[PDB]
Amino acid sequence: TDLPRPSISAEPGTVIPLGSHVTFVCRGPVGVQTFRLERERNYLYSDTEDVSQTSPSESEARFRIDSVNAGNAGLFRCIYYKSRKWSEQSDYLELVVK
Amino acid sequence: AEKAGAAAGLKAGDIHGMKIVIEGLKALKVDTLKSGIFNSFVQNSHYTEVTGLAIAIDTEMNEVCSATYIGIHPICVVREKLGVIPKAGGTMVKQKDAITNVLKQALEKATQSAEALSETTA
Ligand SMILES: [Pt+2]
Numbered sequence: 001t002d003l004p005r006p007s008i009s010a011e012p013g014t015v016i017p018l019g020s021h022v023t024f025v026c027r028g029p030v031g032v033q034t035f036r037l038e039r040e041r042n043y044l045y046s047d048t049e050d051v052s053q054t055s056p057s058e059s060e061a062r063f064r065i066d067s068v069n070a071g072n073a074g075l076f077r078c079i080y081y082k083s084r085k086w087s088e089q090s091d092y093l094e095l096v097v098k
Numbered sequence: 099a100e101k102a103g104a105a106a107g108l109k110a111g112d113i114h115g116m117k118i119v120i121e122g123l124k125a126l127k128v129d130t131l132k133s134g135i136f137n138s139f140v141q142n143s144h145y146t147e148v149t150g151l152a153i154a155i156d157t158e159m160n161e162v163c164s165a166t167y168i169g170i171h172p173i174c175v176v177r178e179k180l181g182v183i184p185k186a187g188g189t190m191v192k193q194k195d196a197i198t199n200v201l202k203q204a205l206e207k208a209t210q211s212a213e214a215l216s217e218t219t220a
Contacts, residue, residue, distance in 0.1 A: 001132065030148055041170075042183050043163060044163055044165055044167070046166055069168060071169050072166075072168065081184075085186075086190065089186070
């Protein structure tokens with residue numbers, strides 16, 4: 001039941017102009033029950049229970065903001081909850097607003 | 099004479115049972131929410147409705163402490179005390195359940211403190 005390290009990516013990019021949308025993608029193994037997007041301060045997070053099977057071995061969740069402002073910029077990382085235990089956290093991603 | 103004593107004891111026990119739990123709510127910083135739930139509870143009394151206050155506290159906190167939110171809000175720090183920040187390999191712990199355990203501690207605090215001053219007056 002060791003849970004693999006998840007990963008974060010940002011679509012369409014790491015750098016977004018003010019007012020545009022961006023989407024954080026958390027990917028992990030199959031069967032994750034909850035995904036959590038976290039900022040640098042651990043107490044600021046979003047949980048979601050919609051996970052989509054991308055692959056027979058992977059699953060993913062999406063957190064979108066419809067338009068950025070300078071308060072959205074910072075470090076972001078994921079954790080997932082599957083099979084009675086929380087996972088390890090992913091590496092940080094920095095999204096910057098222009 | 100007995101009636102008036104029971105009524106005065108009920109009044110004293112209500113007013114005193116609420117103060118300890120207002121300490122409880124401002125420990126959670128129900129103070130900083132701009133909905134105004136805190137001020138509303140203090141104006142309307144009815145202290146043992148505190149578990150009611152619980153569910154709104156969750157909804158609002160979820161909205162204002164999300165990774166999406168624009169700006170920083172003082173209430174978010176209280177989550178660490180609630181225990182909803184997870185160590186790797188730990189159980190999930192639901193925020194609403196932690197909030198209800200905080201204010202159940204507050205409410206049984208209040209009831210057994212009010213039971214003494216109900217009997218004290220008479
Ligand atoms: Pt859960």
